[PDB]
Write a protein that holds these residues in place. Structure first.
Motif, PDB file in Angstrom:
ATOM      1  N   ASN A 159      -7.642  21.493 -16.432  1.00 35.21           N
ATOM      2  CA  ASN A 159      -7.792  20.120 -16.902  1.00 35.21           C
ATOM      3  C   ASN A 159      -7.646  19.089 -15.788  1.00 35.21           C
ATOM      4  OD1 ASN A 159      -6.176  17.510 -18.097  1.00 35.21           O
ATOM      5  ND2 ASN A 159      -7.789  18.212 -19.490  1.00 35.21           N
ATOM      6  N   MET A 161      -7.209  15.054 -15.006  1.00 35.61           N
ATOM      7  CA  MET A 161      -6.795  13.809 -15.643  1.00 35.61           C
ATOM      8  C   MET A 161      -6.710  12.664 -14.639  1.00 35.61           C
ATOM      9  SD  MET A 161      -3.603  13.283 -18.260  1.00 35.61           S
ATOM     10  CE  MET A 161      -4.070  14.855 -18.981  1.00 35.61           C
ATOM     11  N   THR A 163      -5.882   8.529 -14.153  1.00 39.01           N
ATOM     12  CA  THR A 163      -5.438   7.205 -14.567  1.00 39.01           C
ATOM     13  C   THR A 163      -5.510   6.267 -13.369  1.00 39.01           C
ATOM     14  OG1 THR A 163      -3.108   7.771 -14.169  1.00 39.01           O
ATOM     15  CG2 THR A 163      -3.956   8.070 -16.404  1.00 39.01           C
ATOM     16  N   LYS A 168      -4.575  13.842 -11.513  1.00 40.94           N
ATOM     17  CA  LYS A 168      -3.688  14.925 -11.927  1.00 40.94           C
ATOM     18  C   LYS A 168      -4.447  16.172 -12.378  1.00 40.94           C
ATOM     19  CE  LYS A 168       0.394  15.780 -14.812  1.00 40.94           C
ATOM     20  NZ  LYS A 168       1.304  15.205 -15.842  1.00 40.94           N
ATOM     21  N   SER A 179       0.883  22.052 -12.245  1.00 39.75           N
ATOM     22  CA  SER A 179       0.224  20.760 -12.092  1.00 39.75           C
ATOM     23  C   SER A 179       0.286  20.242 -10.658  1.00 39.75           C
ATOM     24  CB  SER A 179       0.846  19.730 -13.037  1.00 39.75           C
ATOM     25  OG  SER A 179       2.156  19.380 -12.620  1.00 39.75           O
ATOM     26  N   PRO A 202     -10.530   5.488 -17.522  1.00 34.91           N
ATOM     27  CA  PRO A 202      -9.742   6.721 -17.380  1.00 34.91           C
ATOM     28  C   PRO A 202     -10.428   7.919 -18.025  1.00 34.91           C
ATOM     29  CG  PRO A 202      -8.348   4.912 -18.083  1.00 34.91           C
ATOM     30  CD  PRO A 202      -9.762   4.419 -18.181  1.00 34.91           C
ATOM     31  N   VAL A 203     -10.330   9.090 -17.405  1.00 33.56           N
ATOM     32  CA  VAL A 203     -11.003  10.268 -17.936  1.00 33.56           C
ATOM     33  C   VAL A 203     -10.066  11.466 -18.081  1.00 33.56           C
ATOM     34  CG1 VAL A 203     -13.326   9.644 -17.203  1.00 33.56           C
ATOM     35  CG2 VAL A 203     -11.786  10.792 -15.602  1.00 33.56           C
ATOM     36  N   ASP A 204     -10.362  12.312 -19.064  1.00 28.45           N
ATOM     37  CA  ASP A 204      -9.598  13.532 -19.314  1.00 28.45           C
ATOM     38  C   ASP A 204     -10.556  14.661 -19.687  1.00 28.45           C
ATOM     39  OD1 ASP A 204      -7.737  15.498 -19.904  1.00 28.45           O
ATOM     40  OD2 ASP A 204      -6.477  14.204 -21.142  1.00 28.45           O
ATOM     41  N   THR A 206     -11.765  19.008 -19.343  1.00 27.25           N
ATOM     42  CA  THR A 206     -11.353  20.393 -19.149  1.00 27.25           C
ATOM     43  C   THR A 206     -12.555  21.250 -18.759  1.00 27.25           C
ATOM     44  OG1 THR A 206      -9.565  20.184 -20.783  1.00 27.25           O
ATOM     45  CG2 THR A 206     -10.262  22.413 -20.185  1.00 27.25           C
ATOM     46  N   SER A 231     -16.766  11.184 -19.423  1.00 29.50           N
ATOM     47  CA  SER A 231     -16.494  11.874 -20.679  1.00 29.50           C
ATOM     48  C   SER A 231     -17.748  12.005 -21.544  1.00 29.50           C
ATOM     49  CB  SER A 231     -15.395  11.147 -21.459  1.00 29.50           C
ATOM     50  OG  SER A 231     -15.751   9.800 -21.716  1.00 29.50           O
ATOM     51  N   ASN A 255     -14.738  21.191 -28.182  1.00 31.42           N
ATOM     52  CA  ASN A 255     -13.478  20.447 -28.230  1.00 31.42           C
ATOM     53  C   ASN A 255     -12.447  21.192 -29.085  1.00 31.42           C
ATOM     54  OD1 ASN A 255     -11.880  18.303 -27.413  1.00 31.42           O
ATOM     55  ND2 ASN A 255     -12.537  16.928 -29.062  1.00 31.42           N
TER      56      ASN A 255
END
Lengths: 256, 256, 256
Positions: A159, A161, A163, A168, A179, A202-204, A206, A231, A255
């Protein structure tokens, strides 16, 4: 006729090395201003786009567009015949009977000539590249390779992440979790080690760990790696060449 | 008694390394003027003939001819016990109960002694060596190894073609074809890199790629390799030792 | 809380490397004065005892004894994530939910954090260590590793024989036999290469070659290796750490 001479044969081997795994067959379209190639793996989650400008060669001559496709395994086995300092020349004439590979050394001696048979493929070219991506970052390829190689042992999914001023990388599997948190900085000793980041949203996301390990192969082509995330679309991993690039489009897992 | 001492144990390991593959069992005949050995693979297309003179040793003592045979696998596993700088001594007394191997180091300490059991083999010695061969050439072992290793990936058969002042190695298989053309020249920087060639009659022979890869192992024994060709007899590949040699007789594939 | 920081992460990897093979699971008991661990293989012929003092760390803090057990495979895979020059920190708080591993580099950047899940094991701690052993010897780990690695190819059993001022390693199998005889000496260039030996009673023991190859792994932890032998009890192989040690208790094969 068509003549393209790499100064060092190592360049072409590394470029095909990004193709060696995660795809079986590739279609190379050559024309007046260089060569381009697209290839999609069996599961259609990964697209590899290559572009090599004239300046990446020391000599290039193309009197006519020309499309030639070939098996990567067959091509890679034949790319195990030369020194990484050899001069490599590709030869084809009009309607391609087959492609000719020509190796040459510093000591003007030991001339090796090869002939790889060509194939017929479907020209379904993809232009899925996006105007604007939600977030963009760049970092040393060696650092990024370490991050992926580390977290890969934990799970089959990684994943990413992002911000504000924060990147991350997170993995979570059976044996445990891990992590890696990196932040943007400019290092003036060598501005290469700098980590850059620009965030509109911001994106998240996987990704399948299997495919990321195939993507990080481009580290042998460039000092830095470019990652464009969104995204709404597959991620864009880019490795710059001398007047060219190699791209990896990977669709995120989704998802719940 | 019988005592033969190699200055460096590396020599004997490399010599057996030419025997390690492409044959199972070997018969070593020792006598007053050195040691000789013949071995034939299962398909009887390859014969390996070894001769090691007294000067190749630093110490040699043989009061009596003596024939001792041994399994190469069993011998190779026991040749993995010493530094390549060690002094190696072979010991046997009259009727051979078994052969003794003795290792010794610079620091007069750490003495390792071993005992390999011996076997009974058939003494069908071959003298198929020819007076005159149709063509003869010599070249750097490293260059010749590259040529074979390259073309081997293309097919199971490699063709050697010789015309006046021209040597041409050609391979042709499923994925494609390849060819390496070398010509005679004298390089005065080091006269070792020179390629020599003498032709009485032009030759065109085809060999099993499986067996050539086994033959090129002699590169660890000599800077140059000797190839004697004829369309009437098996080819002769020779690697020179210090007052000795290792030979490979290979029968060409034939015919249409 | 509980914080233990290795100066270099290489130390902890090598220590677990002695545990990596020849045992599946291990129980680490931490307390005010350091950490200890015992582990027994499936056949109960080998016991591994580890003790790491405070001085082996650069930082150690334990406000409370704490026992944490973990799978070595799961732990080793997570110990493949850091440079051998990184600083490694172990984190746990009271009742252990799970153990935390923390990596850090010279360039204060690239912080990697991991979490390994913990397990429940049986606290059957063994104190089989003996007051007096029949014979004791010490020698360079590199020399001892060579002796074992050499003789291992001959048989599945290795015999150790000690007489007055004489140490004899003997192996005997199918393909043949071998023996290495070493004697006590003091070398003043580096007193490390010295071989020491003290004999109260002569000993003759035979060990499974499978287990000795697992024991010699401690060579990456110390320059010298300690061997305490007795015909009444399992042998003691000891590798010294900086204010600590790693021990291997191996039961001899027996009998006719």
């Amino acid at each position: 006729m068509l003549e393209a001479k790499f100064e060092e044969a190592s360049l072409f081997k590394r470029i095909i090395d990004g193709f060696k795994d995660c795809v079986q067959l590739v279609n190379f379209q050559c024309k007046e201003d260089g060569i381009i190639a697209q290839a999609v793996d069996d599961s259609r989650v990964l697209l590899v786009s290559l572009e090599i400008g004239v300046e990446a060669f020391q000599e290039y001559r193309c009197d006519h567009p020309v499309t030639l496709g070939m098996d990567l395994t067959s091509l890679s086995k034949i790319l195990r015949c030369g020194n990484n300092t050899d001069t490599l020349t590709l030869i084809a004439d009009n309607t391609p009977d087959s492609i000719i590979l020509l190796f040459e050394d510093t000591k003007k001696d030991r001339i090796a000539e090869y002939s790889l048979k060509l194939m017929d493929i479907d020209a379904d070219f993809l232009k899925i590249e996006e105007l604007q991506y939600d977030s963009t970052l760049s970092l040393p390829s060696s650092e990024f390779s370490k991050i992926v190689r580390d977290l890969s042992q934990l799970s089959d999914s990684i994943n990413i992440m992002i911000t504000k001023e924060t990147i991350k990388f997170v993995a979570d599997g059976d044996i445990g979790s891990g992590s890696v948190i990196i932040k943007p900085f400019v290092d003036m000793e060598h501005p290469e080690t700098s980590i850059k980041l620009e965030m509109d949203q911001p994106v998240d996301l996987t990704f399948g760990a299997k495919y990321l390990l195939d993507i990080i192969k481009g580290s042998s082509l460039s000092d830095r790696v470019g990652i464009r995330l969104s995204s709404e679309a597959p991620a864009l991993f880019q490795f710059d060449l001398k007047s060219g690039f190699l791209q990896f489009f990977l669709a995120p897992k989704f998802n719940d």
